[PDB]
Amino acid sequence: STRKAVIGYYFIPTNQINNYTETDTSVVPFPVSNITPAKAKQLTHINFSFLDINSNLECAWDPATNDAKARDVVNRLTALKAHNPSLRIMFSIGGWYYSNDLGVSHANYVNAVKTPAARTKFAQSCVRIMKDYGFDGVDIDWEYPQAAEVDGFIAALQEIRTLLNQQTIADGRQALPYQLTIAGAGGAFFLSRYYSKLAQIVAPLDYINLMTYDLAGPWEKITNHQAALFGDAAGPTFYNALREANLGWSWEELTRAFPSPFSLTVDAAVQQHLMMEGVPSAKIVMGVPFYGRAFKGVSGGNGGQYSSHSTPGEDPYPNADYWLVGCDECVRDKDPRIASYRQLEQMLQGNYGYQRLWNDKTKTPYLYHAQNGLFVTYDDAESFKYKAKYIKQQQLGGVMFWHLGQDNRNGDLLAALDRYFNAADYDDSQLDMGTGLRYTGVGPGNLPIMTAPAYVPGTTYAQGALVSYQGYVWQTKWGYITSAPGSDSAWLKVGRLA
């Protein structure tokens, strides 16, 4: 009955910091004053974003940042702690723009973690920045260290953890200790970069916040839900890259863990984490998007789902055709491919030609514009009922979302998440989780409780026979077997004794 984490990003670009104002939404659309006391009480963490790693290989603000203005913005966030003694203002280092393989600062990430001396200088800079600006913990969003850089990343996280723990003691902060989190991959292709060492990555963290969204987008040929909870057999499937990770597992072990192809869903990412030994459910946080992804040039037949499309994938958006009818924020941001939940509500409400439809397998909503051939995948307070029930059922740590400025003006999405976890009068015991496709993989970290007859020496066991032995349930891979389970390759450990 530990409180579920509710971790919301506060993203503010450098130009908005430098021109910070709370009275002109054309300059700063989402100032700190829009985070009311009521919203502050519903959050456990705000991730202030983004800081970077500079060419000196230290955590640093964008050098174009006006420091006085930056401190003013952060001070406004930390003042919110007055409303909620559990609230932390984290800061996030990285993000896609800075840290992707082709990002402007990518080499600084690689180099900062490369050697013990670099790791010390980097780790010290993270805690120095945390203390100088008054933040409550460090969140690292490197998207993503490659398999070869992973050992350095692990050591960097370990070293930051030690320094944060020292700082908690120095400041008498045992009631609200300084924390360390990362934004983790929420799909198997990026996850495969560091998957084999997942337990080492998670060990120094309070949470790993899964980016379980952007699972569809203009870079894929076929439209799809970007954050389906469960799978739809009518939707696309994907190769399971995890089966090629350097795990040292056998064919049967790999096959049971990593069905391929599979449905790229939130459940898949969560289960992929739980399959690894040493990765506790309580540290896994489910990311949800407060925005939708829009596609144009879609066909009818299934409400724009699973259709080819003509949505540019380039950055920046390559022309001035802002084709997402009714999306005023898209004109402001010169990109019709992403729309906040705040804007999507208005688009539904106005005379713009959208239908709201629901996929009861994926448990997510979508908009379809039949006249122009548009499809929008997004999440809302209804999809969040299923995701919140899943968080509770699977004993996850909580929820994370990008970003606070995209909730509607009344903060309905954040209020819904808070309600589903904390409201005494909310009852989801009868909420039907549907017949969407579950990720069926089992690994060492999530063996089901089972029972079976005790193993008997001398007995000749056929293929598929189940026995209990030395604390586990085992299945023969072929027949006929007479060896003791665990003594050779013939037995698969399939379950654990209660």
Q: Judging by beta carbons within 10 Å of its beta carbon (0-12, 13-18, 19+), is residue 393 exposed, middle or buried?
A: exposed
Helices (H) and strands (E) in the chain, counts: 15, 17
How far from the centroid of its chain's Cα atoms is residue 332's Cα? 27
Amino acid (1-letter code) at residue 181: T
CB 138 within 8 A of CB 160: yes
Peptide bond into 144 cis (omega under 30): yes
Sheet holding 354-359, edge to edge: 338-340, 291-295, 374-377, 364-369, 354-359
CB 359 within 8 A of CB 366: yes
> What dihedral do alpha carbons 295, 297, 302, 305 form, nearest 10°?
-30
Residue 484: CB atoms within 10 Å = 15
Q: How many residues does the chain have?
A: 498
Q: Any residues with CB less than 8 A from the CB of 265 and at least 6 apart, and which?
A: 215, 228, 229, 230, 231, 362, 436, 437, 439
CB 444 within 8 A of CB 277: yes
Q: List, by residue number, the catalytic residues.
A: 143
The DSSP string of 68-92 is: HHHHHHHHHHHHGGGG-TT-EEEEE
Sole residue written with tokens 């144009």 = 296
In units of Å, what resolution does this entry have? 1.7
3-class secondary-structure state, position 98: helix
68 is in an annotated binding site: yes
3-class secondary-structure state, position 365: strand
Determination technique for this entry: X-ray
97 is in an annotated binding site: yes
Question: Which residues share a beta bridge with 441?
Answer: none
List the one residue out of 465, 495, 469, 459 whose CA is nearest residue 477: 465
Amino acid (1-letter code) at residue 409: R
Contacts 24+ apart (CB under 8 A), 311-317: 311/218, 311/337, 312/218, 312/337, 313/217, 313/218, 313/219
CA dist., res. 216 & res. 225, Å (int): 6
67 is in an annotated binding site: yes
Q: What angle in degrees, to the nearest 10, is found between the helix axes of 266-274 and 381-393? A: 20
Amino acid (1-letter code) at residue 283: K
213 is in an annotated binding site: yes
Domains and CATH numbers, the chain: 1-289+380-447 (3.20.20.80), 290-379 (3.10.50.10), 448-498 (2.10.10.20)
211 is in an annotated binding site: yes
Sole residue written with tokens 């379809």 = 368
CB 230 within 8 A of CB 307: no
CB 460 within 8 A of CB 444: no
Contacts 24+ apart (CB under 8 A), 168-176: 176/85, 176/86, 176/88, 176/136
Phi and psi at 207, nearest 5°, equal -145, 150
